[PDB]
Ligand SMILES: CC(C)(C)c1ccc(N(C(=O)c2c[nH]cn2)[C@H](C(=O)NC2CCCCC2)c2cccnc2)cc1
C-alpha cells in the first residue's frame with residue numbers, strides 16, 4: 207500500500223556521468239562505451255549565444271580542446287562529431303560501468319526519472335513527465351546541462367532526455383540522445399516561450415484507478431459518458447483530448463477494478479465540476495497527471511482493496 | 513528553477529542489496545563489510561508470527577538455513593546473531609562495494625530516501641519523512657521487507673531505516689539499523705495502529721521559503737507574530753510546536769529572502785485560518801511538510817555527492 211512519486215534507482219546512470227569542459231564552459235556528459243554525449247552548446251562563448259554557427263565553431267576545435275573528467279581521471283578525446291544538437295566525443299577508454307542501454311524518443315505524457323548533476327557529479331533523482339507543450343517541469347540550476355532522463359524497465363536503461371536549457375517560465379527544454387529537441391525549441395539565446403500547457407487526461411484517469419486499487423471510492427458515481435461528450439467537457443478545463451488509444455491502454459486497470467473506462471471518465475467530469483470538498487486522493491488535493499497507466503501497474507498491487 | 517521531491521542518488525546503496533531466504537520466506541538484506549542485516553521476522557512461520565519467541569526460533573537454525581544471494585552468487589553464511597529486531601548474518605566475503613557509511617537514528621520530521629527492493633533487486637527510490645507518529649508514508653508491496661532508508665553527506669551514507677511492516681491504514685513501520693523500532697510497534701501479528709499524526713511546522717515553513725525562492729509570493733503579508741502567539745495557533749490546527757531552535761535553523765533562508773521566520777509564521781497563520789482561496793503553492797493545494805530546511809538549501813544550491 208501507499209503511492210509515491212517513485213523514480214528508478216539511479217546507480218546505473220551515476221556510473222556514466224562525466225564532466226566536459228570547453229574553454230570556460232563546464233557541463234555534464236554521458237559516457238557510454240567509448241563515446242561521451244553532451245550538449246553541443248558547450249562550444250559556445252558569451253558572444254556566440256544568440257546565433258551560433260555550430261559547424262563553424264566546431265571546425266576550429268581540436269580533440270585536445272575538450273577536457274573530459276571521470277571522477278579524478280582525465281579521459282583522452284580522440285575524435286569528435288556533431289549529431290543534431292548533441293556533441294559526441296570519442297575517447298580512448300570504454301566505460302567499464304556501461305550498463306545495458308538503448309536510446310528512445312518519447313511522446314508527451316510519458317514519464318521518466320532525472321538524475322540532476324553538476325560538474326559531472328550527481329545531486330539527486332526525481333520523476334518528471336514530458337508535458338503536452340514539450341517542456342518538462344524539472345528542478346535544474348546553472349550547470350545542470352547534460353543531465354539525463356531515463357527509464358529502467360527490465361534491467362536495460364532507456365535514455366530519453368538530455369537537458370539543454372531553461373525557458374522564461376522556469377520550465378525546461380532538451381533533446382533525445384540523437385540530439386533532436388522535443389518541441390519547437392532551439393539551442394540559441396533568442397527569445398522562446400513554452401506554449402500554453404494542458405493536463406494529461408489519460409494519466410489523471412490512471413491515477414484515479416490507482417486510488418481505487420488502494421481502497422478509495424468516494425469520487426465514483428452512478429453515471430457514464432460518451433467519449434465525445436467527455437472530451438467536450440474536459441477541454442473546457444484545459445485537459446488534453448482522450449483518444450481511443452488511451453481508452454484501450456486503460457483496459458487492464460479497468461478490468462482489475464471493475465470500473466469501465468467511460469464510467470471513470472464520468473467521475474473525472476464530476477471532480478472537475480465539484481472539487482474535492484476538503485478531501486484528498488492519494489495524499490493530493492489536486493488531480494495528479496504525472497503517473498502513466500504503466501507506472502500505476504508497476505507501483506500498485508495486482509489485488510484491489512475492495 | 514523548479515522544486516521537486518528529490519531523493520539522494522541511490523547507487524552507493526544499490527551495491528549493498530541482497531536476497532535473504534529462510535524456509536519459505538524471501539526478503540531483502542543489506543550487505544556491508546562481511547555482515548548481512550535483515551528483519552529478524554524472516555525466521556518466522558505463519559504460526560510463529562502470531563506470538564513469536566525469537567531466541568528459540570534462531571537456535572534451531574543452522575547457517576545453511578539462510579540462503580543469501582548477491583545477484584546470482586550465493587554467499588556462504590558462517591555465523592548468525594540477533595540485535596534487537598535485526599538479524600545479522602556473518603558471511604565469508606566482505607562486500608567489495610561497501611561504501612563509507614554510518615548507522616544513525618533519526619528524529620521525527622527528518623527526511624530520508626527509501627530504496628524499495630524485491631528479491632534483493634532495487635526497484636524504485638523515493639523521498640520520505642519520519643512522521644511525528646513514527647510511521648512513514650511509504651509505497652511498499654509484499655516482499656519489500658528489508659528495504660532501507662538513508663541520507664548522504666559528501667561520500668558517507670547514513671543508514672537510518674529498515675522496513676518491517678505495513679499497518680492497517682496503509683502506512684509503514686520499521687527500525688533503525690541497530691534494530692530499534694521507530695514508534696510503539698512490535699514485529700508480531702497483533703492489533704496495531706498508527707496514532708493521530710501532526711504536521712511538521714518547521715518543514716512547512718521551509719517549503720514556503722522554497723516557494724518564495726521560486727517566485728511564488730502571493731501568500732506573503734505585512735504582518736509578523738510571536739512564537740507564543742503562533743504556537744497557540746499551531747496547537748489548534750494539530751501542527752507541531754515551533755521552537756527557537758527551529759527559528760535559528762531557518763535563519764539562512766530568512767536572510768536570503770528578506771522574510772523573517774515570524775513574518776512567515778504570520779503567512780502560515782493566515783493560510784491555516786483562511787485556506788488558499790483557490791490558489792496553489794509550488795504546484796500543491798496542500799501545505800507540504802516533507803522538506804526540511806536542509807533539503808531546501810541543498811536543492812536550491814546544487815550540492816553533489
Ligand atoms: C544566455 C544566458 C542568459 C547568459 C544563460 C542562461 C542560462 C544558462 N544555463 C546555465 O547552465 C548557466 C551556466 N552559467 C550561467 N548559466 C542553462 C541554460 O538555460 N542554457 C543555455 C544554453 C542554450 C542557449 C541559452 C540557454 C540553464 C540554467 C538553469 C537551468 N537549466 C539550464 C546559460 C546561459
Ligand SMILES: CC(C)(C)c1ccc(N(C(=O)c2c[nH]cn2)[C@H](C(=O)NC2CCCCC2)c2cccnc2)cc1
Nearest residue numbers: 207553561652653654655656657676677678699700701
Ligand atoms: C499474513 C499477513 C499478517 C496479513 C501479512 C501481511 C503482510 C506481510 N508482508 C509481506 O511482505 C508479505 C509477503 N508475502 C505476504 N506478505 C509485509 C508485512 O507487513 N510484514 C509482516 C512482518 C511482521 C508481522 C506482520 C507483518 C508487508 C506487506 C506489504 C508492505 N510492507 C510489508 C506478511 C504477512
Ligand SMILES: [Cl-]
Nearest residue numbers: 734735736737
Ligand atoms: Cl504585525
Ligand code: NA
Nearest residue numbers: 733735775778
Ligand atoms: Na508577514
